[PDB]
Design an enzyme around this catalytic site. Structure first.
Site, short mmCIF file in Angstrom:
data_model
loop_
_atom_site.label_atom_id
_atom_site.label_comp_id
_atom_site.label_asym_id
_atom_site.label_seq_id
_atom_site.Cartn_x
_atom_site.Cartn_y
_atom_site.Cartn_z
N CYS B 110 -27.56 30.37 35.34
CA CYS B 110 -27.94 31.77 35.54
C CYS B 110 -29.45 31.94 35.44
CB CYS B 110 -27.22 32.69 34.55
SG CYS B 110 -27.81 34.39 34.62
N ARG B 113 -31.31 35.14 32.86
CA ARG B 113 -31.05 35.15 31.42
C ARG B 113 -32.16 35.75 30.58
NH1 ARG B 113 -29.62 29.12 30.15
NH2 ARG B 113 -30.39 28.74 32.30
N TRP B 282 -26.88 42.76 38.03
CA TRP B 282 -27.35 43.27 39.30
C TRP B 282 -27.67 42.06 40.17
CZ3 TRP B 282 -30.02 44.70 34.71
CH2 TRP B 282 -31.19 43.97 34.44
N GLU B 287 -28.65 36.35 47.14
CA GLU B 287 -27.20 36.26 47.07
C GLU B 287 -26.54 36.96 48.26
OE1 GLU B 287 -25.46 36.53 42.97
OE2 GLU B 287 -27.29 37.73 42.56
C1 HEM Z 1 -28.91 41.00 34.62
C2 HEM Z 1 -29.05 40.53 35.87
C3 HEM Z 1 -28.52 39.14 36.31
C4 HEM Z 1 -29.01 38.49 37.36
C5 HEM Z 1 -30.18 38.98 38.25
C6 HEM Z 1 -28.29 37.24 37.49
C7 HEM Z 1 -28.51 36.29 38.46
C8 HEM Z 1 -27.66 35.24 38.72
C9 HEM Z 1 -27.58 34.48 39.95
C10 HEM Z 1 -28.41 34.70 41.24
C11 HEM Z 1 -26.65 33.55 39.79
C12 HEM Z 1 -26.21 32.54 40.87
C13 HEM Z 1 -24.93 33.16 41.46
C14 HEM Z 1 -24.51 32.37 42.67
O1 HEM Z 1 -25.40 31.77 43.33
O2 HEM Z 1 -23.29 32.35 42.96
C15 HEM Z 1 -26.08 33.66 38.46
C16 HEM Z 1 -25.10 32.86 37.91
C17 HEM Z 1 -24.42 33.09 36.72
N1 HEM Z 1 -24.60 34.22 35.92
FE1 HEM Z 1 -26.22 35.51 35.97
N2 HEM Z 1 -27.35 37.17 36.48
C18 HEM Z 1 -27.45 38.34 35.74
C19 HEM Z 1 -26.65 38.67 34.67
C20 HEM Z 1 -25.61 37.93 34.15
C21 HEM Z 1 -24.70 38.35 33.10
C22 HEM Z 1 -24.74 39.75 32.44
C23 HEM Z 1 -23.85 37.34 32.87
C24 HEM Z 1 -22.70 37.26 31.84
C25 HEM Z 1 -22.71 37.96 30.70
C26 HEM Z 1 -24.21 36.25 33.74
C27 HEM Z 1 -23.59 35.02 33.82
C28 HEM Z 1 -23.74 34.11 34.85
C29 HEM Z 1 -23.01 32.88 34.99
C30 HEM Z 1 -21.94 32.39 34.00
C31 HEM Z 1 -23.41 32.26 36.09
C32 HEM Z 1 -22.85 30.91 36.59
C33 HEM Z 1 -21.66 31.17 37.50
C34 HEM Z 1 -21.09 29.86 38.00
O3 HEM Z 1 -21.32 28.79 37.36
O4 HEM Z 1 -20.40 29.89 39.04
N3 HEM Z 1 -25.29 36.63 34.50
N4 HEM Z 1 -26.74 34.71 37.83
N1 LIG Z 2 -18.36 30.85 50.10
C1 LIG Z 2 -17.11 30.93 49.97
N2 LIG Z 2 -16.56 31.20 48.78
C2 LIG Z 2 -17.31 31.67 47.74
C3 LIG Z 2 -17.77 30.82 46.74
C4 LIG Z 2 -18.53 31.33 45.67
C5 LIG Z 2 -18.81 32.70 45.60
C6 LIG Z 2 -19.63 33.31 44.48
C7 LIG Z 2 -19.56 32.52 43.17
N3 LIG Z 2 -20.39 33.11 42.12
C8 LIG Z 2 -20.32 34.54 41.83
C9 LIG Z 2 -21.40 34.95 40.85
C10 LIG Z 2 -21.41 34.38 39.59
C11 LIG Z 2 -22.39 34.73 38.67
C12 LIG Z 2 -23.39 35.63 39.01
C13 LIG Z 2 -23.39 36.22 40.27
N4 LIG Z 2 -24.37 37.08 40.65
C14 LIG Z 2 -24.80 38.11 39.93
N5 LIG Z 2 -25.99 38.66 40.18
C15 LIG Z 2 -23.97 38.63 38.83
C16 LIG Z 2 -22.60 38.81 38.65
C17 LIG Z 2 -22.32 39.33 37.38
C18 LIG Z 2 -23.44 39.53 36.55
S1 LIG Z 2 -24.87 39.07 37.44
C19 LIG Z 2 -22.40 35.86 41.20
C20 LIG Z 2 -18.33 33.53 46.61
C21 LIG Z 2 -17.58 33.03 47.66
C22 LIG Z 2 -16.22 30.74 51.16
C23 LIG Z 2 -16.42 30.77 52.54
C24 LIG Z 2 -15.25 30.54 53.27
C25 LIG Z 2 -14.09 30.31 52.52
S2 LIG Z 2 -14.55 30.42 50.85
#
Ligand code: HEM
Ligand SMILES: N=C(Nc1ccc(CCNCc2cccc(NC(=N)c3cccs3)c2)cc1)c1cccs1
Ligand code: HEM
Ligand SMILES: N=C(Nc1ccc(CCNCc2cccc(NC(=N)c3cccs3)c2)cc1)c1cccs1
Ligand SMILES: C[C@H](O)[C@H](O)[C@H]1CNc2nc(N)[nH]c(=O)c2N1
Ligand SMILES: C[C@H](O)[C@H](O)[C@H]1CNc2nc(N)[nH]c(=O)c2N1
Ligand SMILES: [Zn+2]
Lengths: 418, 414
Positions: B110, B113, B282, B287
């Site tokens: 993330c 953070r 947010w 993304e």
């Molecule tokens: C406050 C604004 C925040 C921003 C701008 C942000 C940004 C991001 C981004 C861009 C990613 C990559 C997501 C992706 O490429 O799929 C990410 C991953 C992640 N975020 Fe943050 N985040 C925020 C808040 C949070 C919060 C509040 C939590 C949980 C309490 C969190 C937990 C995570 C986790 C666990 C991942 C890894 C997800 C995975 O391994 O698939 N984030 N974050």
């Molecule tokens: N790309 C695909 N799947 C797919 C894989 C991963 C994801 C997103 C995985 N991660 C979501 C995520 C995790 C943590 C943070 C964020 N982004 C944020 N800014 C936040 C979410 C909550 C707090 S911050 C998004 C979406 C679709 C596919 C294409 C065709 C078939 S499946």
């Protein structure tokens, strides 16, 4: 067995080749060092004066691999080569590669280079044996011929020149340049930098050795060549051998007035080539550029030529805040121009879309015939537009195979002058 | 022992001691690095749970400068009684907040953070039914959305017991657009969500069959069959995408939702497992603009945008894809900021993350970071994180992946 998956195509490949891995990666099951530039100091033989029980096992392993490569494991020539290497080590504390072994080893060091997106080309490598060289003048002649062959009037050909291997660590051959063709960098009186900031220290050594700098933005550096451990010597590469590309844009007439150029031949000259426990400390190798290397890194790194601000100005972009993405917009335009310019002058270049596509195909090939392909995602993914290239969505396993290219220290940190 | 990371652009060097505290696998070995594998590799016994709980309670009491105190020792004894008598235990509210914040602080992938200590924690451990989960989630969405001034929040549902009574949000995010396979092989809406859309339809959802249909909530309480709920439309904030210079861009008909709220991960605190823990923050612009809109398998709008830009698409080396990509990402940022919906561009986000990393190294001894995920999916090397060496390791509390619930749920009706 270990699987890697492409998340765009769902292709899964199964890796067995990693079972032949020799050296530590730096990682453990509790920590990953995948983004550390030099994660490990695990070498294959101590610093020098390798004893018989230290060198011979490495030689036997390499000879075994080469003779297995050609379906001749256990043959008379294989068994003869072993006893031959045994005698040489016994009588000289080292041994000498056959021409075939040298070519095989150089190609496989490239094939094993996990950071290299260009390895689909790995078996098309011209190998110049320079192991008879004795002086810096001879090194300069060998390098000039390499540059001329590899440039080939712009139809670039991959090549490597291999100078005598290390003996005792006091008689090293070294090219002090990091690449055969680089631009100078100069510290200005106020504090800014002219030319290429990466090369300021090396430029100062050249100046401190008698080089008369023209003090420009794109000054081709002299060669600083060290033969048999002696003090390095300066040579000027003949300019007719240094192919250069003026950088212009297919839409922006004003782009040419930025006065940018770059050279056509990238030729890495500071790495060490390791074959069968032997260490080739001077082994310049060259291929051709991926556009991003110049357009993204050389031109747009903050500590390199750092031209983003200037280009964005001429583009009349809103540079007040980052969220206008003016950096990203100018970066694209710069990389369009670099490609358009090389392509206009028929100088070989590859864009990052084609290069990464080729590498996915190379990965296929390697898993099919070899059971794996070591690959460093952090280096393979291009430094712009990462996720619209196929390698971004490709899982990769990274492991260290031998022969290999290794980093080595800059010789001015270790050389005792005379 | 110590480990050093270097920033190759600034030459700042940081010393990592925090990695000594990790006791979970990364997946790499001493001879292979799996740092680009998406995921390397019923529930806990009494003896497994004792040391896990002890480590967390110890960490909590250390964090509040109360280690070794009378309250620390009584809490350990209290926890031990519960594990002995009930095979599990219950976190105090302070512990739950502390744990959820540190799971975020420990999320090595993330980039956001720097905000980790500003997290609104909604304790939903008294919930018993899917209707209850809906109420909790509506309130979460409304608080977090805050009319566009987005606030980070998490809602935590009851922890796992025997694994047969899990609470699960079946959605992958709380707000997400449907996808529909067409008979001709094309896809309407979001291709990423086709499978979950099919599940919803089968459960009785009547789909509008449009390009941006907000999916219904599919909510599972206490291991029962999940139930459908429609989020009230006035709680779903959306942003129509237009471009500050291309007046034709609005005619693409693009929009996105303002609140990213991930709902399919598992929150592990002191060995307890919170299988339903949706959290929201947010967006970072890329993304939406790079992945959501331009992944070949997603909305895949590069061709249409590049067409309207009159770009030469005959050869890759014109970089028409790269050129269209930047413009799409400009539009996304301009659109959110014009509607005053919180968003962060990738330059600002990576810049803040570097400051966060340095702060964390100074005050905590390190900051586990996953370079492969931290670097944005465009313009990588012109952001500072690209030049930052990082160390990846697993600390707990943490967020974990878990299987999709339709692959493991055993159904009850008819
Ligand atoms: C406050 C604004 C925040 C921003 C701008 C942000 C940004 C991001 C981004 C861009 C990613 C990559 C997501 C992706 O490429 O799929 C990410 C991953 C992640 N975020 Fe943050 N985040 C925020 C808040 C949070 C919060 C509040 C939590 C949980 C309490 C969190 C937990 C995570 C986790 C666990 C991942 C890894 C997800 C995975 O391994 O698939 N984030 N974050
Ligand atoms: N790309 C695909 N799947 C797919 C894989 C991963 C994801 C997103 C995985 N991660 C979501 C995520 C995790 C943590 C943070 C964020 N982004 C944020 N800014 C936040 C979410 C909550 C707090 S911050 C998004 C979406 C679709 C596919 C294409 C065709 C078939 S499946
Ligand atoms: C034929 C065209 C080739 C292309 C397009 C290509 C492409 C690349 C690129 C873009 C990099 C990253 C460079 C950087 O970021 O500084 C790289 C790394 C590397 N290449 Fe290739 N390459 C080619 C040929 C070769 C050849 C002929 C060799 C050796 C015989 C080679 C060996 C390596 C090695 C060892 C690295 C790793 C460098 C390091 O660790 O610092 N490549 N390659
Ligand atoms: N970034 C800096 N220094 C720096 C400069 C260049 C490199 C690049 C190192 N590797 C060069 C290389 C290796 C392998 C392949 C290539 N590129 C090629 N296409 C080929 C070269 C030979 C055959 S293919 C380049 C690293 C740090 C600095 C800025 C300011 C002070 S230092
Ligand atoms: C810290 C990080 O490992 C370092 O900046 C790397 C990132 N990936 C790279 N990838 C390539 N091809 N070349 C590089 O110099 C780097 N630099
Ligand atoms: C194979 C590779 O690990 C995978 O495609 C990763 C690369 N880095 C990523 N980084 C982020 N932030 N999000 C992602 O989905 C991915 N995907
Ligand atoms: Zn690793």
């Amino acid at each position: 067995f270990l699987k890697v998956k492409n998340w765009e195509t769902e292709v899964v490949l199964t890796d067995t080749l990693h079972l032949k891995s020799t050296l530590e990666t730096g990682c453990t099951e509790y920590i990953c060092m995948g983004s550390i530039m030099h994660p490990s100091q695990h070498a294959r033989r101590p610093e020098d004066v390798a004893t018989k029980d230290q060198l011979f096992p490495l030689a036997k392993e390499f000879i075994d691999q080469y003779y297995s490569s050609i379906k001749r494991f256990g043959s008379k020539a294989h068994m003869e080569r072993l006893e031959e290497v045994n005698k040489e080590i016994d009588t000289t504390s080292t041994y000498q590669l056959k021409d075939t072994e040298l070519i095989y080893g150089a190609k496989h060091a490239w094939r094993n280079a996990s950071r290299c997106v260009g390895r689909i080309q790995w078996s098309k490598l011209q190998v110049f044996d320079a192991r008879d060289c004795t002086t810096a003048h001879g090194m300069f002649n060998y390098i000039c011929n390499h540059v001329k062959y590899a440039t080939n009037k712009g139809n670039l050909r991959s090549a490597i020149t291999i100078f005598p291997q290390r003996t005792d660590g006091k008689h090293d051959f070294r090219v002090w340049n990091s690449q055969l063709i680089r631009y100078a960098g100069y510290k200005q009186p106020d504090g800014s930098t002219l030319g290429d900031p990466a090369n300021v220290q090396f430029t100062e050594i050249c100046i401190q050795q008698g080089w008369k700098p023209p003090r420009g933005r794109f000054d081709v550096l002299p060669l600083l060549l060290q033969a048999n451990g002696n003090d390095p010597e300066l040579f000027q590469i003949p300019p007719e051998l240094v192919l250069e590309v003026p950088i212009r844009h297919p839409k922006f007439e004003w782009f040419k007035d930025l006065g940018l150029k770059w050279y056509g031949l990238p030729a890495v000259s500071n790495m060490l080539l390791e074959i069968g426990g032997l260490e080739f400390s001077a082994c310049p190798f060259s291929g051709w550029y991926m556009g991003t290397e110049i357009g993204v890194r050389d031109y747009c790194d903050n500590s390199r030529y750092n031209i983003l601000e200037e280009v964005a100005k001429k583009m009349n972009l809103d540079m007040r805040k980052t969220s206008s993405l003016w950096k990203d917009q100018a970066l694209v335009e710069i990389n369009i121009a670099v490609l358009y310019s090389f392509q206009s002058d028929k100088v070989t270049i590859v864009d990052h879309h084609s290069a990464t596509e080729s590498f996915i195909k190379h990965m296929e090939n390697e898993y099919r015939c070899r059971g794996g392909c070591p690959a460093d995602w952090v280096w393979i993914v291009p430094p712009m537009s990462g996720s619209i290239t196929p390698v971004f969505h490709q899982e990769m396993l990274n492991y260290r195979l031998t022969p290999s290219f290794e980093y080595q220290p800059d010789p001015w940190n270790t050389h005792v002058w005379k």
